[PDB]
Amino acid sequence: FSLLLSKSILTFFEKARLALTIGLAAVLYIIGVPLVWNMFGKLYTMMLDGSSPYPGDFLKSLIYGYDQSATPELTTRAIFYQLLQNHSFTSLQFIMIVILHIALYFQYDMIVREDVFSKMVFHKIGPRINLKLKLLNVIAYFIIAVVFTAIYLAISYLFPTFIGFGLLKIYFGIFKVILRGLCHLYYLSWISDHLIHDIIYLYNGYTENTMKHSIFIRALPALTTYLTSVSIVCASSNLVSRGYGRENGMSNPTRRLIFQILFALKCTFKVFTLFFIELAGFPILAGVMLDFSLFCPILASNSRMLWVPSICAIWPPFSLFVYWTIGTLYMYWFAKYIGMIRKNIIRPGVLFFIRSPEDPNIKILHDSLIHPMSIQLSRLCLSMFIYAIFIVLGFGFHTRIFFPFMLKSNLLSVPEAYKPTSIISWKFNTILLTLYFTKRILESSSYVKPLLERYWKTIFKLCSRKLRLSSFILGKDTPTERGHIVYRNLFYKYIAAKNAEWSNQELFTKPKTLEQAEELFGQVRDVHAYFVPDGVLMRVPSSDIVSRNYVQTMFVPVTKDDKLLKPLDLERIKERNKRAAGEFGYLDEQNTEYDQYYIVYVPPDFRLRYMTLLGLVWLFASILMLGVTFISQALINFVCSFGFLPVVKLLLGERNKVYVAWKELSDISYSYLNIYYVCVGSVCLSKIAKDILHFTEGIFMAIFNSIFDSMLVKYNLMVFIAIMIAVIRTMVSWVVLTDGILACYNYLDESLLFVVWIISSMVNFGTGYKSLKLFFRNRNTSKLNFLKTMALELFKQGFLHMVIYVLPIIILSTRMQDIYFGLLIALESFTFFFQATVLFIQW
């Protein structure tokens, strides 16, 4: 036994050495390194200002720094809270810096690898003791990390901030000169005064060093230095490229490499800016207007203007994540709607400007490199403005200017008692989970989308037929749409429209011009209406995937036989193409595989007609959404006020808390908006959708699938079970030790009990990590297999441990004292002996 006993002691020593090396390295690299970074940042800020926030005492200065806590005390608890906050701040800064560097390097690599980038470049320049040893390493690496952090923070914050002071003083002087010139030109109280006050406040805070806490006012000099450096790089690329071209070769190799680097950086910044806008600022601003128009008037008061900032009061930066999420969700749903319309309802070619999700001729990087930044940015701005019109007008009208004022109704406003106030609150979480589960149920159903598509087909056909846009929007039109019916009198035009139409028996048989129609009205009294053809046939693109050059030639009027009514102005088209392109126009090679055109009829006043069509689309979408919402709410309310509530009144009583809660909920629902009722009714109508489809031409299973099949619920449940089993086994272990061995020893210092509790907690967190390992193995398994595996694991490592140790003690709890204590000692000794025997057998 002695030989491999000593060997096992050596293995335990190796374990302990490895555990200590990992633990010390982890604690240092996770705590000290962010704290060393933050202390160096505070020291550099003090050097820049020249004075510490707390003169003389540098610890408090290096602990609290430039914070708003008024004279905080040096309490160990206060110190711990402050250091946690400092660690969070520095972790956020480091994460942001690392992400920015990674994104920029990836953009640089992708652009450099691109072949069209090489073509652009060629166009511009033209052709040519062991434990101790390990620890030593850990400490040495930590010292290297600390000195690297000091140097990097120096070169990245200290010097940039000083150069920022200089450059920002220069720019303030230049701005002052420009303002003086503007005032001279000009010469030769609530809103503006408030804005002037805010700007003067910011300027005084920066210049007089009063705002020492603001992140923005501290980063202003460094940000100015970085922006100036970027501007210099972008301008110097063009400056180096001056003169040289495809004809004038650039012989010098060093200058060639310098330009290659500068141009790569310029393209990196251009593509990064465009992508950052389109992917963050586009969704974030869309979410901001969604908050302004829909969420704030509904989940908050109409008087307020934004709602997400209030619920993100815990950590205001999370409002950006919330805004991005809601904006991205809105854009995804709008893209789905446009996809449905494009797929089935409207003519293929109408929505050519909107980007087609399934387009083989998509080269995002190539287009970002070649097309000028101004043109792409302008297209983004107009698309953003159109999305703003849709969001703000379409939702905010109903939520702000229609229901509260015209109808004087709170039917589109959550009741005061159920308005969420914080993101972590139960109200917000319940609303969000209800919406998520209902969305999952609706998407899972196979009859909702079809019915919706049929509704939109009917709506589009009706609106287009009314506006005489059937040919342009749908592709099929009767000849009656190709002219307006001129009536003799306004009475016949409006009051007697049907009578006047019936009077003319030659209306659609023969076309009459306007002057001829007036002449016939003057001559004859029997007929008071005639058909006057108007509008001209036009060429329109026959597919959504059409080269941008083709679009510039495919909106020209034509005769019946595909002959242009006016000779095409080719030179103007070429000039517009040159403007739409840039120095790199020829490099773009647009594919003409899908460049075909339809000859469709376009009525007069086309712009007004399709604007009215979009207005009618908004009107009918609003009618559909409001009808679905209110029908769902009314259906559930009728079911849950004339249905279950009387039953609860009989069974649960008339004064029970549950009965009062649901009764008040229903009574408010008759006048307010309950999202829960709306969602449940939406599920019910989704079920009725099949019957609706059949006539016009299970529930619990679906709910179960949607709930217990989503990855969110699975992850939440598995984490909950892991925590539960860990805490259960910790309670078992602590109770066993204390109310067993300790009590028996006493029969025969909180610090020690907390220490052993920590040890048991660590070992049982390892036990829980065993279940976490089970999670990954069973992540994709079926619901029944998942539930059975989870139940067996929980049972065995939970209630089995419960029964083996605690329950006999439960039952067991003069000679009877001795019997009790001896029996408990014997059972503990038997368990210890069994464990030791198993370990010895394995050994």
Ligand SMILES: CCCCCCCCCCCCCCCCCC(=O)OC[C@H](COP(=O)([O-])OCC[N+](C)(C)C)OC(=O)CCCCCCCCCCCCCCCCC
């Ligand atoms: C960059 C702009 C695109 C923005 C992307 C996001 C917008 C989402 C879709 C909204 C469509 C409405 C915007 C119309 C803008 C037309 C710009 C253009 O390039 O036109 C050139 C063309 C030609 O204009 P022209 O007749 O002046 O001729 C110009 C001739 N050349 C090219 C030689 C100079 O105009 C059109 O073809 C207009 C067609 C509009 C058809 C409308 C389809 C309705 C179907 C419903 C979809 C909308 C659902 C959302 C509605 C919800 C309301 C709340």
Ligand SMILES: CC(C)CCC[C@@H](C)[C@H]1CC[C@H]2[C@@H]3CC=C4C[C@@H](OC(=O)CCC(=O)O)CC[C@]4(C)[C@H]3CC[C@]12C
């Ligand atoms: C205000 C300063 C101090 C920092 C600003 C950071 C924000 C603008 C953050 C908050 C949420 C971040 C977004 C959170 C997550 C992602 C997902 C990511 O998605 C993809 O890259 C898709 C790629 C593919 O699948 O092809 C794009 C960046 C983005 C939106 C981030 C962009 C930057 C955002 C908007």
Ligand SMILES: CC(C)[C@@H](C)/C=C/[C@@H](C)[C@H]1CC[C@H]2C3=CC=C4C[C@@H](O)CC[C@]4(C)[C@H]3CC[C@]12C
């Ligand atoms: C205003 C310009 C013309 C003058 C003053 C140049 C200032 C230099 C010091 C600036 C301009 C660009 C800055 C710069 C660019 C890129 C990086 C990489 C990053 O990972 C750390 C910061 C670091 C290393 C900084 C250091 C400071 C630089 C080099």
